[PDB]
Amino acid sequence: HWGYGKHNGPEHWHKDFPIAKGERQSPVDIDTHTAKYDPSLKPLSVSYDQATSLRILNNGHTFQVEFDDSQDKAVLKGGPLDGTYRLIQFHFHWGSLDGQGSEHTVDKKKYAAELHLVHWNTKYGDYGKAQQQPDGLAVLGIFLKVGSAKPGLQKVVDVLDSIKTKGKSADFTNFDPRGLLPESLDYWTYPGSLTTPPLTECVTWIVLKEPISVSSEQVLKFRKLNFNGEGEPEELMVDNWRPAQPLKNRQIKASFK
Ligand SMILES: Cc1cc(C)nc(Sc2c(F)c(F)c(S(N)(=O)=O)c(F)c2F)n1
Ligand SMILES: Cc1cc(C)nc(Sc2c(F)c(F)c(S(N)(=O)=O)c(F)c2F)n1
Ligand code: NA
Ligand SMILES: [Zn+2]
């Protein structure tokens, strides 16, 4: 079905998922000149001290690290958020080349990759229920640029050969996602959507200003994953990003400057 190829990529999605042409689609270009400092935003509270990772999965589109979300452990709050959002998983989007791969752009700049830490609003009880609500999810987006290796990423990079193909999973316990954060928690925020089908308009996006640095070797390893299942023709999992979508009426707010 949907994917990122010429035949089933982002410009095709609207035929199965009409909200693809909706009023709050993601990602977007972040025009840093037009974003407004909002002195009423609070600092983000990223509380990942008790995160419990469980598993890593190649889902055929990306790979995702999944967390135990059956209690309040790893939570995002503050900033533009009302209430408490629980971390359920993180995943990445990346390019076939270092000069593309991110979903959001900054003044049209593309980064090599983008990390998404997905959280759901605990007022809706479960992730699945939250995926249906306008303020159901909060996704923390972090850009990756190629430079110095990110030591906190290497445990993820090293397990990818065990999940090469669609539907493969591996145990992945005791991974600390604090090691994927940049120094600064300065951010942009705007209301948007899932960037993959079903493209539901349920996401408060929080995009950090500071990218993390990863090495060329780290991102090359992402590019060795496969979209296909085992035993099927090999198609490299690369360019699994949706381009920027129309901003429409929306305002992007800055936590800083
Ligand atoms: C490239 C390809 C491979 C296969 C196996 N089926 C298809 S048919 C198809 C499909 F199943 C889809 F789900 C989609 S979509 N709107 O992108 O979700 C599509 F465009 C399609 F063209 N296309
Ligand atoms: C709707 C749904 C349900 C489930 C269980 N996983 C997913 S995986 C996923 C995904 F692939 C994504 F790309 C995103 S994203 N880019 O953060 O909007 C997401 F939130 C996701 F949760 N999506
Ligand atoms: Na659940
Ligand atoms: Zn994503």
Residue numbers in the entry: 4 to 125, 127 to 261
Can you list sentences taken from the study reporting this PDB entry?
To structurally investigate the binding of benzenesulfonamides with CA VI, we have engineered CA VI-mimic and applied in crystallographic studies. The space groups and unit cell parameters of CA VI-mimic crystals were similar to those of CA II. There was one unique protein-ligand complex in the asymmetric unit. On the other hand, in the active site of CA II we had only one position of fluorinated ring – between Leu198 and Thr200. It looks like the replacement of Phe130 in CA II with tyrosine in CA VI-mimic enabled additional position of fluorinated ring of ligand due to a steric collision between the fluorine atom of fluorinated ring and the oxygen atom of Tyr130 side chain (the close contact found in the structure was 2.5 Å). The alternative position of the fluorinated ring of compound 14 in the active site of CA VI-mimic probably was available only due to spatial fluctuations of Tyr130 side chain. Also, due to a significantly larger size and the hydrophilicity of the side chain of Gln134 in CA VI-mimic compared to Val134 in CA II, the hydrophobic dimethylpyrimidine tail of inhibitor 14 was repelled in CA VI-mimic (see para-group of the cyan ligand). Therefore, the change of size and the hydrophobicity/hydrophilicity of the residues 130 and 134 upon mutation could be rationalized as the main causes for the relatively significant difference in the binding affinities: inhibitor 14 bound to CA II 40-fold better than to CA VI-mimic (Kd_intr values were 0.37 nM and 15 nM for CA II and CA VI-mimic, respectively).
